[PDB]
Amino acid sequence: SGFRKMAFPSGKVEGCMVQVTCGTTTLNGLWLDDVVYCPRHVICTSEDMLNPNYEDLLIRKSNHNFLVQAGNVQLRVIGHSMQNCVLKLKVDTANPKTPKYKFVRIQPGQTFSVLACYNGSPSGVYQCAMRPNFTIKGSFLNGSAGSVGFNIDYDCVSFCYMHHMELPTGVHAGTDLEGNFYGPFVDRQTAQAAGTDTTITVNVLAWLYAAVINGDRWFLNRFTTTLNDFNLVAMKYNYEPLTQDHVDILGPLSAQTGIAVLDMCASLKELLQNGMNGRTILGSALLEDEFTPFDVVRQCSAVKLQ
Amino acid sequence: SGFRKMAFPSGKVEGCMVQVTCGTTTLNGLWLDDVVYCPRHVICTSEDMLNPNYEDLLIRKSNHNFLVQAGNVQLRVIGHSMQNCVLKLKVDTANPKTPKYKFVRIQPGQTFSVLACYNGSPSGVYQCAMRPNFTIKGSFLNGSAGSVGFNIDYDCVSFCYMHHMELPTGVHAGTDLEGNFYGPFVDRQTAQAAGTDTTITVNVLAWLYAAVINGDRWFLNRFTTTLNDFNLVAMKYNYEPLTQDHVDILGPLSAQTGIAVLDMCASLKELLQNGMNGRTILGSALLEDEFTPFDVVRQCSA
């Protein structure tokens, strides 16, 4: 029992992290087969970051201006190219530790594990969600760029995030592994702001189910609301609107608990309007929105009476 | 910036997890050099768990009763001995992925990473604190026993916890890697209760320093206190005592932010006596006590 924000074991991704130097800048890269992926702003100097012309910066480079290290093993760079906001370095050696992998672009509300790295070395792992404003509420310092987010299904690693920068409100932005940014952000050291961040309603509901399964049930109401009725309250408290597809996703959690989904919505409604009266839910004083319904299912398996 | 429960990367520990089976009982083992460490209840049926005589149960086993499986390769057990509540199985192959390691017994309030495993196969990793009542609040299902807790210091894995069992409140109980339980618990199926938990005061202060480092500045007040006066309020609010040794541990964070340790004691005293008045600290409406001072510097400094 118990219920924790849990990250995937990071060993497979650790086997892919390398150090990428260009000029005087070191950050992290991802070594898959014979390609190293990393943020293109590794070619900037500290003078270049207000409005870099990345094409112009890159034609000034050659393979000799990149140093890639996989641990103490040197990787000879034999090609480079720029795809959107990621640099792809071709190297003379395919990574023998390459897992089965995919590149996927996740939707807001979906979670993933982050392996934070500095100078090519894994430093920590933790669980994150793509927020509705396309930021990540992470923990990153200077030198973390090129850290990646991922999920593991079976033995296949789905890479979904590569980290580029920190917005001044203390949240983080980055790209998929094809280099397309999540959200309206660009890789420059300019003034940009996260949009208003809303709460992921479906995930809050899944977390409440997790609380019920683990015995925390003080907040339930035998009351049924409607989708339209709930959504009026949702917009008042800056919650993502709830769709019928959200209700479908929560069907299995609903069967295991014997609490219908619109009952749980009425329970969540009452928490929004009245607060939690000084009690906690799963050790938390806030409504938690970074567990997906699948994340809850993996961690709270139960017998079904038939 | 940002502050998050952050575990150490699990790769070096994943290379040590094996599956240990004795009869119809399977749990997790830690393979280091030519030894596998696992909870001794691997040698029990459902019936034995009521009141096991572990010595008599073990002396009835042989090497061949023990199935150790590392991935797709089985290892031969070539000796077995019991150390307190853990079993040490000698295996005929030294783990080529053995990291530099040490075994440490940790104190309440310290944190560690847990690599939850089922059937010898890693499932997930997360941070835990050793509570003052010597339990942890983890996420362990049946079959997770033998999962281990660890810190990584440079190239070295300090193993400090191995999981054994679940208590009636859903908290978890375990041993160090010498098989000595944390807390008054025993590896038998009888009613045992976690003691009254207390808030790890020095960790709360460390978390407040982490807030200020991130920019959450509002709880500060230039009112101050003595250590003896602060603890009087601490006692009443079920907070652990704050020792001079705790004040020393916070010294490095004190000089980073510029806030004297007892000044942050005075601010937390105000937080306890009034509540937070609807605000949050580091995106929490509660005073978080599961980040040590070392955990904070790990996340805010170079």
Coordinates of C-alpha atoms in Angstrom, one line a residue:
Chain A
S1 CA 0.0 0.0 0.0
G2 CA 0.7 3.7 0.2
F3 CA 0.7 6.1 -2.8
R4 CA 3.7 8.1 -3.9
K5 CA 4.7 10.2 -6.8
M6 CA 6.9 7.5 -8.5
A7 CA 9.3 7.7 -11.4
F8 CA 10.4 5.0 -13.7
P9 CA 13.7 3.2 -13.0
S10 CA 16.3 5.3 -14.8
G11 CA 18.9 2.8 -15.7
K12 CA 18.0 2.5 -19.4
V13 CA 18.1 6.3 -19.9
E14 CA 21.3 6.6 -17.8
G15 CA 23.0 4.3 -20.4
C16 CA 22.2 7.0 -23.0
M17 CA 23.3 10.2 -21.3
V18 CA 26.5 11.9 -22.6
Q19 CA 28.3 15.2 -22.1
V20 CA 28.3 17.6 -25.1
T21 CA 30.8 20.4 -25.3
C22 CA 30.8 23.1 -28.0
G23 CA 33.1 26.1 -27.7
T24 CA 33.1 26.7 -23.9
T25 CA 29.6 25.3 -23.2
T26 CA 28.9 21.9 -21.7
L27 CA 25.4 20.4 -21.4
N28 CA 23.8 17.0 -21.8
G29 CA 23.0 14.9 -24.8
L30 CA 21.1 11.7 -25.6
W31 CA 23.0 8.9 -27.3
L32 CA 20.8 6.6 -29.4
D33 CA 22.3 4.3 -32.0
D34 CA 24.9 6.6 -33.6
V35 CA 23.2 9.9 -33.0
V36 CA 23.6 12.3 -30.1
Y37 CA 20.6 14.6 -29.5
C38 CA 21.0 17.8 -27.6
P39 CA 19.6 21.4 -27.3
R40 CA 20.8 23.6 -30.2
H41 CA 21.6 26.4 -27.8
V42 CA 24.8 24.5 -27.0
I43 CA 26.3 26.5 -30.0
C44 CA 25.5 29.9 -28.3
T45 CA 27.9 32.0 -26.3
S46 CA 26.7 34.2 -23.4
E47 CA 26.7 37.1 -25.9
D48 CA 24.5 35.3 -28.4
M49 CA 21.4 34.5 -26.5
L50 CA 19.1 37.5 -27.0
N51 CA 18.3 36.7 -30.6
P52 CA 20.7 34.0 -31.9
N53 CA 20.7 33.3 -35.6
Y54 CA 21.2 29.6 -35.1
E55 CA 21.8 28.9 -38.8
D56 CA 24.5 31.5 -38.9
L57 CA 26.0 30.2 -35.7
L58 CA 26.1 26.6 -36.9
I59 CA 27.7 27.2 -40.3
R60 CA 30.6 28.6 -38.4
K61 CA 31.1 25.2 -36.8
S62 CA 32.6 21.9 -37.9
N63 CA 32.6 18.4 -36.5
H64 CA 35.9 19.4 -34.7
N65 CA 34.1 22.0 -32.6
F66 CA 32.1 19.3 -30.7
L67 CA 33.4 17.1 -27.9
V68 CA 31.2 14.3 -26.8
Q69 CA 32.0 12.0 -23.8
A70 CA 30.0 9.0 -22.7
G71 CA 31.6 8.5 -19.3
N72 CA 35.3 8.3 -19.9
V73 CA 34.7 7.0 -23.5
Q74 CA 35.3 9.6 -26.2
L75 CA 32.8 9.7 -29.1
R76 CA 34.2 11.0 -32.4
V77 CA 31.7 13.3 -34.0
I78 CA 31.4 12.8 -37.8
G79 CA 28.3 14.9 -38.6
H80 CA 26.0 17.5 -37.4
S81 CA 22.6 18.9 -38.4
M82 CA 19.9 21.0 -36.9
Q83 CA 16.3 19.9 -36.7
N84 CA 14.0 22.6 -35.3
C85 CA 15.5 23.3 -31.9
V86 CA 17.7 20.2 -31.5
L87 CA 21.2 19.5 -32.7
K88 CA 21.8 16.0 -34.0
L89 CA 25.5 14.9 -33.8
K90 CA 26.4 11.8 -35.8
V91 CA 29.1 9.8 -34.1
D92 CA 31.4 7.0 -35.2
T93 CA 29.9 4.5 -32.7
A94 CA 26.4 3.2 -32.1
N95 CA 25.5 3.2 -28.4
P96 CA 25.7 -0.5 -27.3
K97 CA 23.3 0.3 -24.5
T98 CA 20.5 1.7 -26.8
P99 CA 17.1 0.5 -25.5
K100 CA 14.1 -0.1 -27.5
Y101 CA 12.8 3.5 -27.9
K102 CA 10.2 5.8 -29.4
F103 CA 9.9 9.5 -29.8
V104 CA 6.5 10.7 -28.7
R105 CA 5.0 14.2 -28.2
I106 CA 2.8 14.0 -25.1
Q107 CA -0.5 15.9 -24.6
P108 CA -1.0 18.2 -21.6
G109 CA -2.1 16.2 -18.6
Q110 CA 0.2 13.3 -19.3
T111 CA 3.1 12.6 -16.9
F112 CA 6.6 11.4 -17.4
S113 CA 9.9 10.8 -15.6
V114 CA 12.7 13.3 -15.7
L115 CA 16.3 12.2 -15.3
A116 CA 18.1 15.5 -14.5
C117 CA 21.8 15.6 -15.5
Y118 CA 24.9 17.9 -15.3
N119 CA 28.0 17.5 -17.5
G120 CA 26.6 14.3 -18.9
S121 CA 26.2 12.7 -15.4
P122 CA 22.8 11.7 -14.1
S123 CA 22.0 13.6 -10.9
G124 CA 18.4 12.9 -10.0
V125 CA 15.1 11.4 -11.1
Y126 CA 11.6 12.7 -10.5
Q127 CA 8.0 12.6 -11.9
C128 CA 6.5 15.5 -13.9
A129 CA 3.4 16.4 -15.8
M130 CA 3.0 18.5 -18.9
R131 CA 1.0 21.3 -17.4
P132 CA -1.9 22.8 -19.4
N133 CA 0.2 26.0 -20.1
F134 CA 2.8 23.6 -21.5
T135 CA 5.3 24.2 -18.7
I136 CA 6.9 21.6 -16.5
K137 CA 7.1 22.2 -12.7
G138 CA 10.6 20.7 -12.4
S139 CA 13.8 21.2 -10.5
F140 CA 16.7 22.3 -12.8
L141 CA 19.8 24.4 -12.5
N142 CA 22.2 25.8 -15.1
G143 CA 23.8 22.9 -17.0
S144 CA 20.6 20.7 -16.9
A145 CA 19.7 21.4 -20.5
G146 CA 19.5 18.2 -22.5
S147 CA 18.1 16.3 -19.6
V148 CA 15.2 14.2 -20.9
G149 CA 11.8 13.1 -19.8
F150 CA 10.5 9.6 -20.7
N151 CA 8.1 6.8 -20.0
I152 CA 8.8 3.1 -20.0
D153 CA 6.3 0.6 -21.4
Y154 CA 7.3 -3.0 -21.3
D155 CA 11.0 -2.6 -22.2
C156 CA 10.4 0.3 -24.6
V157 CA 11.5 3.8 -23.6
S158 CA 9.2 6.6 -24.9
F159 CA 11.3 9.8 -24.9
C160 CA 9.0 12.8 -24.7
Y161 CA 10.8 15.8 -23.4
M162 CA 14.2 17.5 -23.7
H163 CA 14.9 20.3 -21.4
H164 CA 16.0 23.7 -22.6
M165 CA 15.3 26.6 -20.2
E166 CA 13.7 28.0 -17.1
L167 CA 11.0 30.6 -17.2
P168 CA 11.3 33.3 -14.4
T169 CA 8.3 32.0 -12.5
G170 CA 10.4 29.0 -11.7
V171 CA 9.0 26.5 -14.2
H172 CA 10.6 24.9 -17.1
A173 CA 10.2 24.6 -20.9
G174 CA 11.6 22.3 -23.5
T175 CA 11.0 20.3 -26.7
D176 CA 10.0 16.9 -27.9
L177 CA 12.9 14.9 -29.3
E178 CA 12.2 16.3 -32.8
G179 CA 13.0 19.7 -31.4
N180 CA 9.5 21.2 -31.4
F181 CA 8.9 23.3 -28.4
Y182 CA 6.0 22.6 -26.0
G183 CA 4.0 25.8 -25.8
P184 CA 4.5 29.2 -27.3
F185 CA 8.1 29.6 -26.1
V186 CA 11.4 30.1 -28.0
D187 CA 15.0 29.3 -27.1
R188 CA 16.3 32.9 -26.5
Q189 CA 17.2 34.7 -23.3
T190 CA 14.3 37.1 -23.6
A191 CA 11.4 38.0 -21.4
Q192 CA 8.7 35.4 -21.8
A193 CA 5.9 34.3 -19.4
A194 CA 4.0 31.1 -18.8
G195 CA 0.4 31.5 -19.5
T196 CA -2.1 31.1 -16.7
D197 CA -1.7 27.5 -15.5
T198 CA -4.8 25.6 -14.9
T199 CA -5.3 22.5 -12.8
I200 CA -5.7 19.1 -14.5
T201 CA -9.2 18.1 -13.4
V202 CA -9.1 14.5 -14.7
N203 CA -5.9 13.9 -12.7
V204 CA -7.4 15.4 -9.6
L205 CA -10.3 12.9 -9.9
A206 CA -7.9 10.0 -10.4
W207 CA -5.9 11.0 -7.3
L208 CA -9.1 11.2 -5.3
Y209 CA -9.9 7.6 -6.4
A210 CA -6.3 6.7 -5.3
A211 CA -7.1 8.3 -1.9
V212 CA -10.3 6.2 -1.6
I213 CA -8.6 3.0 -2.4
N214 CA -6.0 3.7 0.3
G215 CA -8.8 4.3 2.8
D216 CA -9.0 8.1 2.7
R217 CA -12.7 8.6 2.0
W218 CA -13.8 11.5 4.3
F219 CA -14.5 13.8 1.3
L220 CA -17.0 11.7 -0.6
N221 CA -20.7 12.7 -1.1
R222 CA -23.5 10.5 -2.3
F223 CA -24.5 13.2 -4.7
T224 CA -24.6 13.3 -8.5
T225 CA -23.7 16.4 -10.4
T226 CA -23.8 16.8 -14.2
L227 CA -21.0 17.5 -16.7
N228 CA -22.2 21.0 -17.5
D229 CA -23.0 21.8 -13.9
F230 CA -19.5 20.6 -12.8
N231 CA -17.8 22.6 -15.6
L232 CA -19.4 25.9 -14.4
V233 CA -17.7 25.4 -11.0
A234 CA -14.5 24.2 -12.7
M235 CA -14.0 27.4 -14.7
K236 CA -14.6 29.4 -11.5
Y237 CA -11.6 27.8 -9.8
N238 CA -9.3 27.6 -12.9
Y239 CA -9.8 23.9 -13.6
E240 CA -9.5 22.2 -17.0
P241 CA -13.0 21.5 -18.3
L242 CA -14.1 17.9 -17.9
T243 CA -15.2 16.0 -21.1
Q244 CA -17.1 12.8 -21.5
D245 CA -13.8 11.3 -22.7
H246 CA -12.4 12.1 -19.2
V247 CA -15.4 10.3 -17.7
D248 CA -14.7 7.3 -19.9
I249 CA -11.0 7.2 -18.8
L250 CA -12.1 7.0 -15.2
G251 CA -14.4 4.0 -15.7
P252 CA -12.0 1.4 -14.3
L253 CA -11.2 3.4 -11.2
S254 CA -15.0 3.8 -10.8
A255 CA -15.7 0.1 -10.9
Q256 CA -12.9 -0.8 -8.4
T257 CA -14.2 1.8 -5.8
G258 CA -18.0 1.6 -6.3
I259 CA -18.0 5.4 -6.6
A260 CA -19.5 6.7 -9.8
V261 CA -17.6 9.4 -11.7
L262 CA -20.1 12.1 -11.4
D263 CA -20.4 11.3 -7.7
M264 CA -16.6 11.9 -7.5
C265 CA -17.1 15.2 -9.4
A266 CA -19.7 16.3 -6.8
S267 CA -17.1 15.4 -4.2
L268 CA -14.5 17.5 -5.9
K269 CA -17.0 20.3 -6.4
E270 CA -17.5 20.4 -2.6
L271 CA -13.7 20.5 -2.0
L272 CA -13.4 23.5 -4.3
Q273 CA -16.2 25.5 -2.7
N274 CA -15.6 24.6 1.0
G275 CA -11.9 23.7 1.3
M276 CA -10.6 20.6 3.1
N277 CA -11.5 21.8 6.7
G278 CA -8.0 21.2 8.0
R279 CA -7.8 17.5 6.9
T280 CA -5.4 15.9 4.4
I281 CA -5.8 13.7 1.5
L282 CA -3.0 11.2 1.0
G283 CA -0.8 13.3 3.2
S284 CA -1.4 16.4 1.1
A285 CA -3.2 19.7 2.0
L286 CA -3.7 20.5 -1.7
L287 CA -5.6 18.9 -4.5
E288 CA -2.9 16.9 -6.4
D289 CA -3.1 16.9 -10.2
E290 CA 0.0 15.2 -11.4
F291 CA -1.2 11.6 -11.3
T292 CA -2.9 10.3 -14.4
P293 CA -5.6 7.6 -14.2
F294 CA -3.1 5.1 -15.6
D295 CA -0.5 6.1 -13.0
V296 CA -3.1 5.4 -10.3
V297 CA -4.0 2.0 -11.8
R298 CA -0.4 0.8 -12.0
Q299 CA 0.1 1.5 -8.3
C300 CA -3.3 0.6 -6.8
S301 CA -4.2 -2.8 -8.3
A302 CA -7.1 -4.5 -6.5
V303 CA -9.1 -7.7 -6.5
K304 CA -12.4 -7.6 -8.4
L305 CA -15.3 -9.5 -7.0
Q306 CA -17.2 -10.9 -9.9
Chain B
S1 CA 15.0 26.7 -9.6
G2 CA 12.2 24.5 -8.5
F3 CA 12.0 22.0 -5.6
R4 CA 10.9 18.4 -6.0
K5 CA 11.1 15.1 -4.1
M6 CA 14.1 13.9 -6.2
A7 CA 15.5 10.4 -6.0
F8 CA 18.9 9.4 -7.0
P9 CA 19.2 7.7 -10.4
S10 CA 18.6 4.0 -9.9
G11 CA 20.8 2.4 -12.6
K12 CA 23.6 1.2 -10.2
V13 CA 21.1 -0.4 -7.9
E14 CA 19.1 -1.9 -10.8
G15 CA 22.2 -3.8 -11.6
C16 CA 22.2 -5.5 -8.2
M17 CA 18.5 -6.6 -8.0
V18 CA 17.8 -10.3 -8.2
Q19 CA 14.8 -12.4 -7.5
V20 CA 14.9 -14.9 -4.6
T21 CA 12.5 -17.8 -4.5
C22 CA 12.1 -20.4 -1.8
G23 CA 9.2 -22.8 -2.4
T24 CA 6.2 -20.7 -3.4
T25 CA 7.7 -17.6 -1.8
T26 CA 9.4 -15.1 -4.0
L27 CA 10.8 -11.7 -3.1
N28 CA 13.7 -9.4 -3.9
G29 CA 17.4 -9.8 -3.3
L30 CA 20.4 -7.5 -3.5
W31 CA 23.3 -9.1 -5.3
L32 CA 26.7 -7.6 -4.3
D33 CA 30.0 -9.4 -5.2
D34 CA 29.3 -13.1 -4.4
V35 CA 26.5 -12.5 -1.8
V36 CA 22.8 -12.0 -2.2
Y37 CA 21.0 -10.2 0.7
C38 CA 17.3 -10.7 1.2
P39 CA 14.7 -10.7 4.0
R40 CA 14.7 -14.0 5.9
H41 CA 11.0 -14.5 5.7
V42 CA 11.6 -15.8 2.1
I43 CA 11.9 -19.2 3.9
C44 CA 8.3 -19.1 5.3
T45 CA 4.9 -20.4 4.2
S46 CA 1.7 -18.6 5.1
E47 CA 1.5 -20.9 8.1
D48 CA 5.0 -20.2 9.4
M49 CA 4.4 -16.4 9.6
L50 CA 2.2 -16.8 12.7
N51 CA 5.1 -17.7 14.9
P52 CA 8.2 -18.6 12.9
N53 CA 11.3 -20.2 14.5
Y54 CA 13.7 -18.9 11.9
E55 CA 16.7 -20.9 13.1
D56 CA 14.8 -24.2 13.0
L57 CA 13.3 -23.3 9.7
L58 CA 16.6 -22.4 8.1
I59 CA 18.5 -25.4 9.4
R60 CA 15.9 -27.5 7.5
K61 CA 16.9 -25.8 4.2
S62 CA 19.8 -26.5 1.9
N63 CA 21.5 -24.4 -0.9
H64 CA 19.3 -26.0 -3.5
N65 CA 16.1 -24.8 -1.9
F66 CA 17.2 -21.2 -2.8
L67 CA 16.5 -20.1 -6.4
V68 CA 18.3 -16.9 -7.3
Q69 CA 17.6 -15.5 -10.7
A70 CA 19.5 -12.4 -12.1
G71 CA 17.6 -11.6 -15.3
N72 CA 17.7 -14.7 -17.5
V73 CA 20.6 -16.3 -15.6
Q74 CA 20.2 -18.4 -12.5
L75 CA 23.0 -18.4 -9.9
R76 CA 23.9 -21.4 -7.7
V77 CA 23.6 -20.8 -4.0
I78 CA 26.8 -22.0 -2.3
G79 CA 26.3 -21.1 1.3
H80 CA 23.6 -19.5 3.4
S81 CA 23.6 -17.8 6.8
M82 CA 21.2 -15.6 8.7
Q83 CA 22.2 -12.2 9.9
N84 CA 19.6 -10.8 12.3
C85 CA 16.5 -10.5 10.0
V86 CA 18.3 -10.8 6.7
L87 CA 19.5 -13.9 4.9
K88 CA 23.0 -13.9 3.2
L89 CA 23.1 -16.4 0.3
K90 CA 26.5 -17.0 -1.1
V91 CA 26.3 -17.4 -5.0
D92 CA 28.9 -18.9 -7.3
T93 CA 29.1 -15.8 -9.5
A94 CA 30.4 -12.4 -8.4
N95 CA 28.1 -9.6 -9.7
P96 CA 30.1 -7.9 -12.4
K97 CA 27.9 -4.8 -12.0
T98 CA 28.7 -4.4 -8.3
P99 CA 29.2 -0.7 -7.5
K100 CA 31.3 0.8 -4.8
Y101 CA 29.0 0.5 -1.8
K102 CA 28.7 0.7 1.9
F103 CA 26.1 -0.4 4.4
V104 CA 24.8 2.4 6.7
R105 CA 22.3 2.5 9.5
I106 CA 20.6 5.9 9.2
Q107 CA 18.9 8.0 11.9
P108 CA 15.3 9.3 11.9
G109 CA 14.8 12.3 9.7
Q110 CA 17.3 11.2 7.1
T111 CA 16.1 10.6 3.5
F112 CA 16.9 7.9 1.0
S113 CA 15.8 6.7 -2.5
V114 CA 13.7 3.5 -2.8
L115 CA 13.8 1.3 -5.8
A116 CA 10.5 -0.6 -5.4
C117 CA 10.9 -4.0 -7.1
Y118 CA 8.6 -6.9 -7.8
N119 CA 9.9 -10.3 -8.6
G120 CA 13.5 -9.0 -8.7
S121 CA 12.5 -6.5 -11.4
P122 CA 12.6 -2.8 -10.8
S123 CA 9.3 -1.0 -10.9
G124 CA 9.8 2.6 -9.7
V125 CA 11.9 4.9 -7.7
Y126 CA 11.0 7.5 -5.1
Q127 CA 12.2 9.5 -2.0
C128 CA 11.4 8.5 1.6
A129 CA 12.2 9.8 5.0
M130 CA 12.9 7.7 8.0
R131 CA 10.1 8.9 10.4
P132 CA 10.8 9.6 14.1
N133 CA 8.7 6.5 14.8
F134 CA 11.0 4.5 12.5
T135 CA 8.5 3.8 9.7
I136 CA 8.5 5.1 6.2
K137 CA 5.5 6.2 4.1
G138 CA 6.3 4.4 0.8
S139 CA 4.5 2.5 -1.9
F140 CA 5.0 -1.2 -1.5
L141 CA 2.7 -4.0 -2.5
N142 CA 3.0 -7.7 -1.6
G143 CA 6.1 -8.9 -3.2
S144 CA 8.1 -5.7 -2.8
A145 CA 10.0 -7.1 0.3
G146 CA 13.8 -7.0 -0.3
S147 CA 13.5 -3.7 -2.2
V148 CA 16.3 -1.4 -0.9
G149 CA 16.8 2.2 0.1
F150 CA 20.0 4.1 -0.8
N151 CA 21.9 7.3 -1.2
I152 CA 24.6 7.9 -3.8
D153 CA 27.6 9.9 -2.7
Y154 CA 30.0 10.5 -5.7
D155 CA 30.5 7.0 -7.2
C156 CA 29.4 5.1 -4.0
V157 CA 26.0 3.6 -3.1
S158 CA 25.3 3.7 0.6
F159 CA 22.6 1.1 1.2
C160 CA 20.6 2.0 4.4
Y161 CA 17.2 0.2 4.2
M162 CA 15.7 -3.1 3.1
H163 CA 11.9 -3.5 3.0
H164 CA 10.2 -6.3 5.0
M165 CA 6.6 -5.6 5.8
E166 CA 3.5 -3.4 6.0
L167 CA 2.0 -2.2 9.2
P168 CA -1.8 -1.8 9.8
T169 CA -1.7 2.0 9.1
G170 CA -0.2 1.5 5.6
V171 CA 3.3 2.5 6.7
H172 CA 6.2 0.3 6.0
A173 CA 8.9 -1.2 8.3
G174 CA 12.3 -2.5 7.4
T175 CA 15.9 -3.3 8.4
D176 CA 19.3 -1.9 7.7
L177 CA 21.5 -4.1 5.5
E178 CA 22.7 -5.9 8.6
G179 CA 19.2 -7.1 9.3
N180 CA 18.5 -5.0 12.3
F181 CA 15.0 -3.5 12.2
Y182 CA 14.5 0.1 12.3
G183 CA 12.1 0.5 15.2
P184 CA 10.5 -2.0 17.6
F185 CA 9.2 -4.1 14.8
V186 CA 9.6 -7.9 14.2
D187 CA 9.2 -10.0 11.1
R188 CA 6.1 -11.9 12.3
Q189 CA 2.4 -11.7 11.7
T190 CA 1.2 -10.2 14.9
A191 CA -0.4 -6.9 15.7
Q192 CA 2.3 -4.2 15.9
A193 CA 1.7 -0.4 15.8
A194 CA 3.8 2.5 14.6
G195 CA 4.5 4.8 17.5
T196 CA 3.1 8.3 17.5
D197 CA 4.8 10.2 14.6
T198 CA 6.3 13.6 15.0
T199 CA 7.3 16.3 12.6
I200 CA 11.0 16.4 11.7
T201 CA 11.7 20.0 12.8
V202 CA 15.2 20.4 11.3
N203 CA 13.8 19.2 8.0
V204 CA 11.0 21.8 8.1
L205 CA 13.6 24.5 8.7
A206 CA 15.7 23.2 5.8
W207 CA 12.6 23.3 3.5
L208 CA 12.0 26.9 4.6
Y209 CA 15.5 27.8 3.6
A210 CA 14.9 26.1 0.2
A211 CA 11.8 28.3 -0.2
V212 CA 13.8 31.5 0.4
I213 CA 16.5 30.3 -2.0
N214 CA 13.7 29.9 -4.6
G215 CA 12.3 33.3 -3.7
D216 CA 9.4 32.5 -1.3
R217 CA 10.2 35.2 1.2
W218 CA 7.0 36.1 2.9
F219 CA 7.1 34.0 6.2
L220 CA 10.3 35.8 7.3
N221 CA 10.1 38.1 10.2
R222 CA 13.1 39.8 11.9
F223 CA 11.7 38.7 15.3
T224 CA 14.1 36.2 16.8
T225 CA 14.1 33.5 19.6
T226 CA 16.3 31.4 21.7
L227 CA 16.7 27.7 21.0
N228 CA 15.2 26.8 24.4
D229 CA 12.1 29.0 23.9
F230 CA 11.6 27.7 20.4
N231 CA 11.6 24.1 21.5
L232 CA 8.9 24.8 24.1
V233 CA 6.5 25.7 21.2
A234 CA 7.9 22.8 19.2
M235 CA 7.0 20.3 21.9
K236 CA 3.4 21.5 22.0
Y237 CA 2.9 21.2 18.2
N238 CA 4.3 17.7 18.1
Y239 CA 7.6 18.8 16.5
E240 CA 10.8 16.9 17.3
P241 CA 13.3 18.7 19.6
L242 CA 15.8 20.9 17.8
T243 CA 19.4 20.3 19.0
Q244 CA 22.5 22.4 18.7
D245 CA 23.7 19.7 16.3
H246 CA 20.6 20.5 14.2
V247 CA 21.5 24.2 14.2
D248 CA 25.0 23.3 13.0
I249 CA 23.7 21.2 10.1
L250 CA 21.7 24.2 8.9
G251 CA 24.7 26.5 9.1
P252 CA 25.6 26.2 5.4
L253 CA 22.0 27.1 4.4
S254 CA 22.0 29.9 6.9
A255 CA 25.0 31.5 5.2
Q256 CA 23.6 31.0 1.8
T257 CA 20.4 32.9 2.5
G258 CA 21.8 35.2 5.2
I259 CA 19.0 34.2 7.6
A260 CA 20.3 33.1 11.0
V261 CA 19.1 29.6 12.0
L262 CA 17.2 30.9 15.1
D263 CA 15.6 33.7 12.9
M264 CA 14.1 30.9 10.8
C265 CA 13.1 29.2 14.1
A266 CA 11.2 32.4 14.9
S267 CA 9.5 32.5 11.5
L268 CA 8.5 28.8 11.8
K269 CA 7.3 29.5 15.3
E270 CA 5.0 32.2 13.8
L271 CA 3.9 29.7 11.1
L272 CA 2.9 27.1 13.7
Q273 CA 1.0 29.5 16.1
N274 CA -1.0 31.2 13.3
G275 CA -1.0 28.8 10.3
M276 CA -0.1 29.9 6.8
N277 CA -3.2 32.3 6.3
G278 CA -4.1 30.7 3.0
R279 CA -0.7 31.1 1.3
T280 CA 1.6 28.4 0.1
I281 CA 5.4 27.7 0.5
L282 CA 7.0 25.9 -2.4
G283 CA 3.6 25.1 -3.8
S284 CA 2.5 23.4 -0.5
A285 CA -0.1 24.4 2.0
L286 CA 1.6 22.2 4.6
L287 CA 5.0 22.4 6.3
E288 CA 7.0 19.7 4.5
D289 CA 9.4 17.7 6.7
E290 CA 10.9 15.2 4.2
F291 CA 13.9 17.3 2.8
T292 CA 17.1 17.2 4.9
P293 CA 19.5 20.2 4.8
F294 CA 21.7 18.1 2.5
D295 CA 18.8 17.4 0.1
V296 CA 18.2 21.1 -0.2
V297 CA 21.8 22.0 -1.2
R298 CA 21.8 19.1 -3.6
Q299 CA 19.0 20.9 -5.5
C300 CA 19.9 24.6 -5.2
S301 CA 23.7 24.7 -5.6
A302 CA 25.9 24.1 -8.7

